[PDB]
Short mmCIF file of C-alpha atoms in Angstrom, two decimals:
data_model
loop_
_atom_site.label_atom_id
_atom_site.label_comp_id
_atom_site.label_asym_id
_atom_site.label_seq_id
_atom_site.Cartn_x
_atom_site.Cartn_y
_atom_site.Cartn_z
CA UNK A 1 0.00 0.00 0.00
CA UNK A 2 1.11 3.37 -1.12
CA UNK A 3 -1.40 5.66 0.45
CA UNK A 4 -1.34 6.65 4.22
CA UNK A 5 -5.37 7.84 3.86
CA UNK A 6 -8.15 5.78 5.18
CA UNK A 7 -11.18 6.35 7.06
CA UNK A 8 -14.99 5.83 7.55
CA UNK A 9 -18.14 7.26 9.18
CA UNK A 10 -18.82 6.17 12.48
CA UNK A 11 -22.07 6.10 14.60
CA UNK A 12 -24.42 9.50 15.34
CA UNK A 13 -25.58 9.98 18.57
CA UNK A 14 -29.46 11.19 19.25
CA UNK A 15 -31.63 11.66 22.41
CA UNK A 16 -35.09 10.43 20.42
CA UNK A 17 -33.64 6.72 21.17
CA UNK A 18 -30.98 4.37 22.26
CA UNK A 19 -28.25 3.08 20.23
CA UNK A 20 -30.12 0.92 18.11
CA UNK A 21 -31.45 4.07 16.10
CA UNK A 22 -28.07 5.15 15.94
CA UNK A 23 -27.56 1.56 14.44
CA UNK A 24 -30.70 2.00 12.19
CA UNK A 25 -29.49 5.37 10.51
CA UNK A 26 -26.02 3.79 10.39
CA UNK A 27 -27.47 0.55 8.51
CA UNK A 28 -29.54 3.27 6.23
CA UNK A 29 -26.37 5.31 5.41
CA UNK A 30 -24.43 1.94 4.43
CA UNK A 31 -27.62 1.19 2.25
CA UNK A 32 -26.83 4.87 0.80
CA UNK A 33 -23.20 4.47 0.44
CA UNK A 34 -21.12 1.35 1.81
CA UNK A 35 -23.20 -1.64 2.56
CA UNK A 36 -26.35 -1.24 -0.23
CA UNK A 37 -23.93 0.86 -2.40
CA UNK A 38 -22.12 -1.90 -3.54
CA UNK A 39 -17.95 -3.22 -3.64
CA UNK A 40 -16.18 -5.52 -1.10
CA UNK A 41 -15.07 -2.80 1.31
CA UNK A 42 -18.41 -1.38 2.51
CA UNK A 43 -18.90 -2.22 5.80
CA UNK A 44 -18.60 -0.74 9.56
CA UNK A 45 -16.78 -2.40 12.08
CA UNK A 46 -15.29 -0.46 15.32
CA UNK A 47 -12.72 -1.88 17.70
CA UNK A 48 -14.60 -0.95 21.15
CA UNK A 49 -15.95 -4.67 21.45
CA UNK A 50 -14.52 -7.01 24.19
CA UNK A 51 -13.60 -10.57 23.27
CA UNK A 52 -15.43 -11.86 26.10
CA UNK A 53 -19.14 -11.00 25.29
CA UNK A 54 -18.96 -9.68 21.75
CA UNK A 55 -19.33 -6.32 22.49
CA UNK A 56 -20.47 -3.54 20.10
CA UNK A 57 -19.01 -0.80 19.96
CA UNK A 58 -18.29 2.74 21.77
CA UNK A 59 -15.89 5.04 19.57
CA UNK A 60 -15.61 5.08 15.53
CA UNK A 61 -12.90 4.04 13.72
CA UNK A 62 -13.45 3.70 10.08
CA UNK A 63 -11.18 2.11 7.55
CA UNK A 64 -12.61 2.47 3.51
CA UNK A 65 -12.13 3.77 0.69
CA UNK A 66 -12.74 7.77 -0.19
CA UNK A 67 -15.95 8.06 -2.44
CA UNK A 68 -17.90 5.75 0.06
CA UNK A 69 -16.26 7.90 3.16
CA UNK A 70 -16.92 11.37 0.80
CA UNK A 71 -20.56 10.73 0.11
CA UNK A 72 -22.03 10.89 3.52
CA UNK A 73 -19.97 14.10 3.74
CA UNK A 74 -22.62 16.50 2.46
CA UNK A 75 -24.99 14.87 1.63
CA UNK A 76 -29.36 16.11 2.74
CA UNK A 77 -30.92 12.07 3.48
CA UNK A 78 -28.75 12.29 6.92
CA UNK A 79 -31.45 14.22 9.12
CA UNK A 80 -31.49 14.06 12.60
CA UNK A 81 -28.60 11.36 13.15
CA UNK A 82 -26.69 14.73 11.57
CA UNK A 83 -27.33 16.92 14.21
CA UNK A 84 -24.47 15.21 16.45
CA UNK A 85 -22.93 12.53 13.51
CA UNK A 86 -20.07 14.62 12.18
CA UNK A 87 -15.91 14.10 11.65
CA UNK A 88 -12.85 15.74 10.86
CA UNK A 89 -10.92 16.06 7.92
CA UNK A 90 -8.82 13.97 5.63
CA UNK A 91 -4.33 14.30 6.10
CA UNK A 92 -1.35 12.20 5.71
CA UNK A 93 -0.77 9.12 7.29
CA UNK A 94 3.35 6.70 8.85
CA UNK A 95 4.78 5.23 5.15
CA UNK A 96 4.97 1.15 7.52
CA UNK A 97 2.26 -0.31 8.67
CA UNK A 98 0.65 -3.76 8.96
CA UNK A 99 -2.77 -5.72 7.21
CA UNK A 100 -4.91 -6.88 10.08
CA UNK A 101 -8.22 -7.35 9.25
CA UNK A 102 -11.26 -7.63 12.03
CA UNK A 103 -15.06 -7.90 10.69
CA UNK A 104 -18.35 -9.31 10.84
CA UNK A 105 -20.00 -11.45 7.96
CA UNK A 106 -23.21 -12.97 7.20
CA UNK A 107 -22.66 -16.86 8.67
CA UNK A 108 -25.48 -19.57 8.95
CA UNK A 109 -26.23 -19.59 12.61
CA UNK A 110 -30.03 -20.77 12.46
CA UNK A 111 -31.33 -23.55 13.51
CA UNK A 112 -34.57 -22.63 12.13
CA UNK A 113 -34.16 -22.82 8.08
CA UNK A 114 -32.27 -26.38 8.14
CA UNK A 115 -35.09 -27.41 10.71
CA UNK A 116 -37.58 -25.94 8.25
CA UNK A 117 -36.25 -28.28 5.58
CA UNK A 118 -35.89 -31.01 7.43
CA UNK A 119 -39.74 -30.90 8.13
CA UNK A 120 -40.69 -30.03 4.72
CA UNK A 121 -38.20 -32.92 3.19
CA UNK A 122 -37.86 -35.35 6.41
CA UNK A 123 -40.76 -35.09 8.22
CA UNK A 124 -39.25 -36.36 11.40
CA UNK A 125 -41.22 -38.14 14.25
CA UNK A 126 -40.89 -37.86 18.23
CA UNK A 127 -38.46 -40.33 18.46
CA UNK A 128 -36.86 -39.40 15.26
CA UNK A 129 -36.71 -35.87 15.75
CA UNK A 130 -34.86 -36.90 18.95
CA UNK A 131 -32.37 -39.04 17.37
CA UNK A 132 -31.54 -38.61 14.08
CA UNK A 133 -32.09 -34.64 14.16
CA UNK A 134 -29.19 -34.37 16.74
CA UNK A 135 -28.27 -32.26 19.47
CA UNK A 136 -26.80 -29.15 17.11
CA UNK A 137 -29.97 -27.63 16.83
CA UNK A 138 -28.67 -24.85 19.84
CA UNK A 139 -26.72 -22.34 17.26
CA UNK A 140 -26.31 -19.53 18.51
CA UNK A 141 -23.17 -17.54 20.41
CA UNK A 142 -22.78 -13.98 22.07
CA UNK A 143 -22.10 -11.67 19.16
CA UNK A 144 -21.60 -8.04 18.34
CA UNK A 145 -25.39 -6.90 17.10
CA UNK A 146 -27.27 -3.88 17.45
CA UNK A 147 -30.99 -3.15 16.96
CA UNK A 148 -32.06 -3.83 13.82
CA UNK A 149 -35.50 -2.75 12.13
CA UNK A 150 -36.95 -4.86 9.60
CA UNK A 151 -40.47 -6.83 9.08
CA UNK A 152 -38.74 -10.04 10.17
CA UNK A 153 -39.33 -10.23 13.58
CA UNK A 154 -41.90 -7.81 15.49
CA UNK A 155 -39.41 -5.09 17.54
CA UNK A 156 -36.00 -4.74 16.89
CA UNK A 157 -33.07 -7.53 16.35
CA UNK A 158 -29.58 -8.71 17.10
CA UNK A 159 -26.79 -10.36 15.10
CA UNK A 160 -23.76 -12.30 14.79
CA UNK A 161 -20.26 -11.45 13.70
CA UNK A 162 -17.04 -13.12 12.15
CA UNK A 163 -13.59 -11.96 11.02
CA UNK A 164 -10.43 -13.63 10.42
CA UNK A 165 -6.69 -13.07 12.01
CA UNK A 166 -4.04 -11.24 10.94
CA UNK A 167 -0.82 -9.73 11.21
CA UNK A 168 2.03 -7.15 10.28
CA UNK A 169 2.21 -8.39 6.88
CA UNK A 170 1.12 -6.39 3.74
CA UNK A 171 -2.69 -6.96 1.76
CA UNK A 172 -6.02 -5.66 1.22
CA UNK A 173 -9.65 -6.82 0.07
CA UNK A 174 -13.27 -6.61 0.77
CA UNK A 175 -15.69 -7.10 3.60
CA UNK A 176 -19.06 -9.18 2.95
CA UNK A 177 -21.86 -7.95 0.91
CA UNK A 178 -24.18 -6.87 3.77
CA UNK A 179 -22.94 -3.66 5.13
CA UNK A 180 -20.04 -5.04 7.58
CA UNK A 181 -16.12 -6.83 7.22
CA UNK A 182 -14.29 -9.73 6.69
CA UNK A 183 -10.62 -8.72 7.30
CA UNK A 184 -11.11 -4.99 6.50
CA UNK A 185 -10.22 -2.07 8.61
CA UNK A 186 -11.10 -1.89 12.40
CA UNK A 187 -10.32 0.32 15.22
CA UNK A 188 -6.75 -0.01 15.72
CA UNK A 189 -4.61 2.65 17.24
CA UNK B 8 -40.58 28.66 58.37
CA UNK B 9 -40.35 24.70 57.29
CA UNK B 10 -41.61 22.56 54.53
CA UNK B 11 -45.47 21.67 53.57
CA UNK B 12 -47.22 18.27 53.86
CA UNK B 13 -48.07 17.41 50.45
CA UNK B 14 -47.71 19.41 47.37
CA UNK B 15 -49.84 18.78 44.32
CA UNK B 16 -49.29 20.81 40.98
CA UNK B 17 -51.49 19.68 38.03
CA UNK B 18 -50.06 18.90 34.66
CA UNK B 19 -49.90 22.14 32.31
CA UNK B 20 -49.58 21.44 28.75
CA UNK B 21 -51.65 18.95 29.23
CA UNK B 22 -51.71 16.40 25.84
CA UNK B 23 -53.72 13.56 24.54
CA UNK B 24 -53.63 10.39 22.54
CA UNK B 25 -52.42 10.53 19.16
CA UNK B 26 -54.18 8.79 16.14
CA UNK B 27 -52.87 6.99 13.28
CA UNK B 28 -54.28 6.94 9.57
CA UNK B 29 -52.57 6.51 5.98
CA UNK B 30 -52.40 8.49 3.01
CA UNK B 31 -50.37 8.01 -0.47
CA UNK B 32 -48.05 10.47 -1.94
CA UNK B 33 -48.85 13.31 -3.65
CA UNK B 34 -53.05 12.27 -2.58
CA UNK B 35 -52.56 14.66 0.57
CA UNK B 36 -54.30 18.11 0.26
CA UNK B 37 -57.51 16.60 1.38
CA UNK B 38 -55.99 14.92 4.87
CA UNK B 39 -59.43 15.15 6.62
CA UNK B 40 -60.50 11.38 5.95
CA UNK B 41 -58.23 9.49 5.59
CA UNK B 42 -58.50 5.65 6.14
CA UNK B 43 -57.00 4.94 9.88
CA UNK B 44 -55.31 1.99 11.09
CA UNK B 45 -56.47 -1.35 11.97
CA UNK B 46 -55.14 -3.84 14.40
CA UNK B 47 -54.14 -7.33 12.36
CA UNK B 48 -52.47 -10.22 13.23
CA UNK B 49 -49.84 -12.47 11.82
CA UNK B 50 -47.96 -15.43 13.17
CA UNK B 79 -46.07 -15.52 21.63
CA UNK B 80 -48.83 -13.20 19.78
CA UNK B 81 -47.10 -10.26 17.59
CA UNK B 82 -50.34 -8.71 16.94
CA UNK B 83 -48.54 -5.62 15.49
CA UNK B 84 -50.14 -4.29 12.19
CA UNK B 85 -48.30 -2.98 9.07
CA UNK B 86 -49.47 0.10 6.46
CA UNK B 87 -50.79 -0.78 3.34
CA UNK B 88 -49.21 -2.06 0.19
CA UNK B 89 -50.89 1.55 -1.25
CA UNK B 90 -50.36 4.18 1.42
CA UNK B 91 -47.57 5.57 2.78
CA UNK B 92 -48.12 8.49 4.32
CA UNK B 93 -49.15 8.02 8.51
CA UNK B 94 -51.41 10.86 9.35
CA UNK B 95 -50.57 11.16 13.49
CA UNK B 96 -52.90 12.91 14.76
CA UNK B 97 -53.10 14.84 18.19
CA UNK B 98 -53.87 17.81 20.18
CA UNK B 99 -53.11 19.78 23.31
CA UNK B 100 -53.55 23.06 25.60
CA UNK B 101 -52.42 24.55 28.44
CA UNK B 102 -54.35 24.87 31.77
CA UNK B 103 -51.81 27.61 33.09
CA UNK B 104 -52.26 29.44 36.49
CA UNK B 105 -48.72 27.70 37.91
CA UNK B 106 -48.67 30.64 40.92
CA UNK B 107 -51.26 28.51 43.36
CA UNK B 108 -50.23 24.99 44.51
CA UNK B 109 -52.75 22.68 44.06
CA UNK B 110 -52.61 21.10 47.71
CA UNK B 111 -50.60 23.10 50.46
CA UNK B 112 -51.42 23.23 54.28
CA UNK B 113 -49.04 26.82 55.11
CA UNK B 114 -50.18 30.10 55.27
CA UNK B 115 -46.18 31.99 55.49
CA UNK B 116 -44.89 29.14 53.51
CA UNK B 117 -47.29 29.83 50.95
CA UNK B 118 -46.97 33.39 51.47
CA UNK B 119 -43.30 33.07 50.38
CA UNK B 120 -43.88 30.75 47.51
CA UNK B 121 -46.42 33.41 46.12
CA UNK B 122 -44.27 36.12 46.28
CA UNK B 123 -41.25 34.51 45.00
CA UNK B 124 -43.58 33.28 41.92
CA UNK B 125 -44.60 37.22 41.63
CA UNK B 126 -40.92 38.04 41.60
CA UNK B 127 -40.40 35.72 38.45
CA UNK B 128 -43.69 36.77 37.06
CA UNK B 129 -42.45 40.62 37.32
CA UNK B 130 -38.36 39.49 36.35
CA UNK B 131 -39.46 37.41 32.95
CA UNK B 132 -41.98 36.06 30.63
CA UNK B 133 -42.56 32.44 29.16
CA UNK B 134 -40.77 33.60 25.82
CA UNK B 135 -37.46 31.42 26.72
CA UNK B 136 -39.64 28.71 27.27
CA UNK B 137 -42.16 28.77 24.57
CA UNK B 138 -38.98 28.99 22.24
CA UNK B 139 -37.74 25.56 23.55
CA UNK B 140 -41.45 23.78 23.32
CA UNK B 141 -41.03 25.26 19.90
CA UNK B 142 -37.83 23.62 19.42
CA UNK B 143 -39.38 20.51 20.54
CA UNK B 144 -42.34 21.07 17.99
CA UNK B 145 -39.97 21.66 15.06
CA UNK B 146 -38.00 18.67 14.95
CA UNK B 147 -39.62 14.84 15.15
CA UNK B 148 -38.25 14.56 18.57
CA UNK B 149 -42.00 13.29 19.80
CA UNK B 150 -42.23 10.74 17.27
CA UNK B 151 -39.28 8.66 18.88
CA UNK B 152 -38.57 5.57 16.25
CA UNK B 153 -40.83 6.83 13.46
CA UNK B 154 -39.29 9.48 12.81
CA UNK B 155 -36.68 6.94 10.68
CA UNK B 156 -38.02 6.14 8.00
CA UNK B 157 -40.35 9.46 6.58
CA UNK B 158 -38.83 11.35 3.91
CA UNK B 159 -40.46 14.91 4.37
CA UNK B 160 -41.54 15.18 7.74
CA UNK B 161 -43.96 17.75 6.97
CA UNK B 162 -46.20 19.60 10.46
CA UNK B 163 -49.61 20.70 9.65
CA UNK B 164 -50.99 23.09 12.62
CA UNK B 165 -53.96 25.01 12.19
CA UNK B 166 -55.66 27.44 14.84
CA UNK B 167 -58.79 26.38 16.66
CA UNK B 168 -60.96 28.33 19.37
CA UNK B 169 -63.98 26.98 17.22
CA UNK B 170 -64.57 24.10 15.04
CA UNK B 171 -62.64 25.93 11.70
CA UNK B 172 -59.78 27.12 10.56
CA UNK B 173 -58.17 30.82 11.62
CA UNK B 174 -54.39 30.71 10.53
CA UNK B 175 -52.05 27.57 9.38
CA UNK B 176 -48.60 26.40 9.52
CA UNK B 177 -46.16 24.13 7.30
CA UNK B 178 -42.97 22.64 8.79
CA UNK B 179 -40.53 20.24 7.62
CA UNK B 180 -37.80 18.36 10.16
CA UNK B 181 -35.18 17.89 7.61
CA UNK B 182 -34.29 21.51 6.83
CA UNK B 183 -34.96 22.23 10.74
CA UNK B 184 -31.76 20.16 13.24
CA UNK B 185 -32.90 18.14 15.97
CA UNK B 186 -30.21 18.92 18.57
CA UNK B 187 -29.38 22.56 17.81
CA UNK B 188 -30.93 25.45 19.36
CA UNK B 189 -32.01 27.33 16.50
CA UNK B 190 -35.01 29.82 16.62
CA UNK B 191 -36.22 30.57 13.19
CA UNK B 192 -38.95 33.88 12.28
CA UNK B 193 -41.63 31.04 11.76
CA UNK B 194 -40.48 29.12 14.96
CA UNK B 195 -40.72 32.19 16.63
CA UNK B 196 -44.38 33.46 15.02
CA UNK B 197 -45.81 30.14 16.36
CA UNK B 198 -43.75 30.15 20.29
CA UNK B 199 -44.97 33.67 20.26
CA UNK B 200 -48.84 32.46 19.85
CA UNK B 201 -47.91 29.72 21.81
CA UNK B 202 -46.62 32.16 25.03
CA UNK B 203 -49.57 34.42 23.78
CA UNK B 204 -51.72 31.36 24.91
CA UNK B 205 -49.16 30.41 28.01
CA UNK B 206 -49.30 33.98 29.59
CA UNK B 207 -52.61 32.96 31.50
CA UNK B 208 -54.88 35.71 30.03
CA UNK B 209 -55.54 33.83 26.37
CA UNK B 210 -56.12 30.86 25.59
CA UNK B 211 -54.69 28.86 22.68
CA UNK B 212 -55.32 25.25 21.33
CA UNK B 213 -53.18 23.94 19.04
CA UNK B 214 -53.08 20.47 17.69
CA UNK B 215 -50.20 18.08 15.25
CA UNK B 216 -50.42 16.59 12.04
CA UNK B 217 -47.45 14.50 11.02
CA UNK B 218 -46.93 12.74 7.83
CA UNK B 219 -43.96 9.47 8.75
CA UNK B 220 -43.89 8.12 5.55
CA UNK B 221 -43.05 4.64 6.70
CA UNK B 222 -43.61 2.90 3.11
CA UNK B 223 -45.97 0.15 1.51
CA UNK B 224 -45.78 -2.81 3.49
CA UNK B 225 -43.90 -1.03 6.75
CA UNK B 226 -45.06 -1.83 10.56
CA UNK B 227 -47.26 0.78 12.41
CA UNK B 228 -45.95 1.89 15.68
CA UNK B 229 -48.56 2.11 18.52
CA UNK B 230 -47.72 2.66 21.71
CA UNK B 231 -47.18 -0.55 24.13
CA UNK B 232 -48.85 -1.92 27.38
CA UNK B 233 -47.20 -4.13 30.34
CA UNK B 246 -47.73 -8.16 21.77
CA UNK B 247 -49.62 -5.52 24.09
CA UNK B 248 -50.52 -2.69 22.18
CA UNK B 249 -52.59 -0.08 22.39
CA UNK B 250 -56.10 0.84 20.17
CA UNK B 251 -59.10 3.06 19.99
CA UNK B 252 -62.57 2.73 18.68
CA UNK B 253 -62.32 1.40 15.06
CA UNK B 254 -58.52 3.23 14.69
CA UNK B 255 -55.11 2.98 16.20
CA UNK B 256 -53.51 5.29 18.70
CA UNK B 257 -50.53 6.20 20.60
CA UNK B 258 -50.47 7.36 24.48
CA UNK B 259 -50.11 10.59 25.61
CA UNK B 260 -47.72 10.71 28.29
CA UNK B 261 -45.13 9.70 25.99
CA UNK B 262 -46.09 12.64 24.32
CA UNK B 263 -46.25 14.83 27.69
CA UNK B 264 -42.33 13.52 28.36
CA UNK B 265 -41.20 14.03 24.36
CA UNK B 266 -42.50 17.44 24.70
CA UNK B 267 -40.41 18.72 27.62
CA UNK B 268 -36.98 17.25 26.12
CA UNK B 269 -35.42 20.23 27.64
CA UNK B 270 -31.87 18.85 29.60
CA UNK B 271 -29.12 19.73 28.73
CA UNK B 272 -27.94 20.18 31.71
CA UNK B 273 -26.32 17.07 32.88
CA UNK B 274 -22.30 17.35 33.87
CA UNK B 275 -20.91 14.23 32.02
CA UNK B 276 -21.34 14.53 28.44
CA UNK B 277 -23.41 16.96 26.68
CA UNK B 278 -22.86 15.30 23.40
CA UNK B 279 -26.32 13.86 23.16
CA UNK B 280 -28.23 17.23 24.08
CA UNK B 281 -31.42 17.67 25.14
CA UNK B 282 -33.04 14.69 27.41
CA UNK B 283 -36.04 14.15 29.64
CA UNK B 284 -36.93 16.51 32.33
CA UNK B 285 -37.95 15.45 35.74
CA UNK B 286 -36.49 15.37 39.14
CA UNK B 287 -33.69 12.88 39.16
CA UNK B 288 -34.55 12.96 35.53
CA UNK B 289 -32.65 11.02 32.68
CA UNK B 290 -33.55 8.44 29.68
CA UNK B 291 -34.51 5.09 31.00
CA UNK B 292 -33.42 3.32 27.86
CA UNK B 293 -29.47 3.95 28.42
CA UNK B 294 -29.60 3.33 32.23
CA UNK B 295 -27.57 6.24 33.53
CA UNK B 296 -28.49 8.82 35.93
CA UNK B 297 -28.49 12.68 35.03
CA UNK B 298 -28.83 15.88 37.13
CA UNK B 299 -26.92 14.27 40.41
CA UNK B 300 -27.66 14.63 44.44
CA UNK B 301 -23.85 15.10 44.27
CA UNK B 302 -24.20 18.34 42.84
CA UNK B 303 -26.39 21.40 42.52
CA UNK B 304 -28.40 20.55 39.70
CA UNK B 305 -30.98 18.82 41.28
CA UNK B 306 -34.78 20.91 41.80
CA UNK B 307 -34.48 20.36 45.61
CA UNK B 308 -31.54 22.18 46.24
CA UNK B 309 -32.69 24.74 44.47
CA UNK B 310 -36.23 25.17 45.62
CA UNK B 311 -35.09 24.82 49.73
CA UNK B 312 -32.49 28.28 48.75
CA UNK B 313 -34.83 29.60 46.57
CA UNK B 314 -37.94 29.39 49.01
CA UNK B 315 -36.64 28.91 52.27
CA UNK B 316 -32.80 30.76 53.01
CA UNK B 317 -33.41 33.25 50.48
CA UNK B 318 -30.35 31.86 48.78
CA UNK B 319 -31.74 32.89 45.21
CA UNK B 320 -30.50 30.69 42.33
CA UNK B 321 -29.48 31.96 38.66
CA UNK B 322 -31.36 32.42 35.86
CA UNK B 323 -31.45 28.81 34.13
CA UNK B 324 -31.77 26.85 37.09
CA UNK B 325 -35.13 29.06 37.73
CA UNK B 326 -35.89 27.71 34.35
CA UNK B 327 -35.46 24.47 35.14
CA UNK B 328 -37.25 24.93 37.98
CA UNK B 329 -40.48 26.41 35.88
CA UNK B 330 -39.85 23.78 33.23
CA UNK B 331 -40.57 21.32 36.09
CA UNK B 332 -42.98 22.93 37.49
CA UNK B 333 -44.77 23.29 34.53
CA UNK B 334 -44.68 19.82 33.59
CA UNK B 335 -47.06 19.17 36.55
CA UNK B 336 -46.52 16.06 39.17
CA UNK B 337 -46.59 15.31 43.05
CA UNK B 338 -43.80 17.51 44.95
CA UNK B 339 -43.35 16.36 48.73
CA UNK B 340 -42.42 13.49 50.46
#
């Protein structure tokens, strides 16, 4: 890497709500310009989550690339979670540094859809269902999530998160498809 | 010279439930009757209805007034006690008006800060306000919450036009009633937001509606005034006031922003407080509630 320049938009804060609005406008400005607005590298991660309860976040530390961190600059569909959501400025950055990567992808951590086609194929009995649909039915793990709107559920949801390890070495790629990371930038230093 | 028994001061700017109905885009300069919003079901019970796959728009619909006359408690046992409180309430009627106030209830009626998730979601927040004594129209008002912040004190010449007919009706010698109609364009096929019970929602006869003392608490988002970290603005204002939903605790016992500090100085030792924390003290005041232990 030859450029010492990369940030990202962190979280607004509000009094109309707790941090799951903040979460909401934050999932609605990745729909506007990181997550729904296509590439690799369009998530947002932050590095204020402890390892032992997958925590979610309490500062912003962005890592992107520059039309997806200069688009929710100026832009007017930012009401609201702009009266407080704001930044600095852009400047020069060390020439070493390492690739470590820290994210959170879409993973299949239902036991509700393999279930469902396990009825709808299976069809398993008492006994059955006890047996041969085994004790790996439990899926689910603390992860980093915030409050979610969608007509999924009836109030607001969680979710999981995964990432990879890295090191001082030298790369760079893309995050999932969904708005978050998969060994892109975190809040490091 | 020493405290009263119980003190009762009634609830000025005193609100009601708010309605729900939906309208369609660019269908609304007839928003008189509109189709309202029924209670389905889908598959514990999440009973929770959506808007239609046609209409967009969510008509909320509410009113309010102010009862006024804050100078006589409602319950008091004293005669010198009372003597004091009236004077000192004379002394702020003769030092100041209810401009300063009427501008923040104004501030609090231009942004969507009573609509507290649906504002997210609406694209034009547009408030329609017309003037009632009778059962017409006298004058009317237009807002939008995008081009108006939701944290800043800002006072524009329309803000300050309606908080002026607003303190017009606060001064307790006219009387104003003004009601809200907000447009959250939540979308076709987007949940309605009712208020919730101890799912358990809330309805009305043949409609949907939303509580009012959620709207009596949005309304006095006030606070700022709370020593840690300002960066979130205005809050909730109460005695040993905060937000519930983060779980901290604003306006300390540890320090002097508390109302019963200042109302034992301010009544009793003659100790007279500053400007703001008098209106603080008229903000809660004005709220209504039960004072003494």
């Amino acid at each position: 890497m030859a450029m010492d320049h990369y940030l990202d938009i962190r979280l607004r804060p509000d009094p109309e709500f707790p941090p799951a609005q903040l979460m909401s406008v934050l999932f609605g400005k990745l729909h506007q310009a990181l997550v729904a607005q296509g590439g690799d590298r369009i998530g947002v991660s932050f590095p204020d989550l402890d390892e032992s309860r997958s925590r979610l976040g309490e500062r912003l530390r962005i890592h992107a690339s520059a039309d997806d961190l200069r688009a929710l600059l100026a832009r007017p569909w930012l009401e609201g979670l702009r009266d407080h959501l704001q930044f600095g400025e852009p400047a020069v950055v060390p020439h070493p540094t390492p690739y470590r990567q820290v994210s959170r992808v879409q993973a299949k951590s239902n036991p509700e859809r393999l279930r469902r086609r396990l009825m709808r194929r299976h069809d398993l009995s008492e006994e059955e269902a006890r047996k041969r649909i085994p004790d790996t039915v439990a899926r689910a793990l603390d992860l980093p999530f915030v409050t979610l709107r969608s007509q999924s559920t009836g109030q607001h949801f969680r979710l999981f998160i995964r990432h990879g390890p890295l090191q001082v070495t030298a790369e760079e790629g893309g995050f999932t498809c969904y708005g978050l990371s998969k060994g892109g930038f975190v809040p490091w230093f | 010279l020493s405290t009263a028994s119980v003190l009762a001061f009634e609830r000025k700017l005193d609100p009601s439930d708010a309605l729900m109905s939906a309208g369609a885009w660019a269908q609304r300069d007839a928003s008189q009757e509109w189709p309202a919003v029924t209670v389905r079901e889908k598959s514990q019970t999440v009973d929770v209805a959506n808007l239609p796959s046609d209409a967009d728009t969510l008509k909320v619909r509410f009113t309010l007034r102010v009862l006024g006359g804050a100078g006589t408690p409602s319950a008091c046992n004293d005669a010198a006690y009372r003597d004091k409180l009236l004077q000192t309430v004379a002394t702020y009627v003769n030092d100041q008006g209810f401009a300063e106030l009427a501008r923040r209830y104004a501030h609090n009626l231009a942004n969507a800060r009573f609509l507290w998730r649906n504002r997210v979601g609406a694209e034009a927040v547009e408030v329609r306000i017309n003037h009632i004594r009778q059962g017409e129209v006298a004058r009317a008002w237009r807002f939008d919450a995008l081009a108006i912040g939701l944290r800043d004190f800002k006072a524009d010449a329309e803000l300050d036009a309606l908080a002026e007919l607003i303190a017009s009706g606060l001064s307790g010698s006219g009387h104003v009633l003004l009601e809200v109609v907000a447009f959250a364009r939540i979308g076709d096929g987007q949940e309605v937001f009712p208020s919730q019970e101890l799912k358990t929602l809330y309805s009305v006869r043949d409609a949907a509606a939303i509580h009012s003392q959620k709207i009596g608490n949005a309304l006095r988002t006030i606070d700022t005034w709370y020593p840690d970290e300002d960066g979130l603005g205005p809050i909730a204002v109460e005695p040993y006031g905060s937000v519930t939903s983060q779980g901290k605790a604003y306006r300390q016992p540890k320090q002097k922003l508390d109302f019963y500090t200042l109302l034992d100085n301010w009544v009793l030792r003659d100790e007279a407080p500053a400007v703001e924390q008098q209106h603080y003290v008229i903000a809660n005041l004005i709220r209504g509630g039960v004072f003494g232990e």
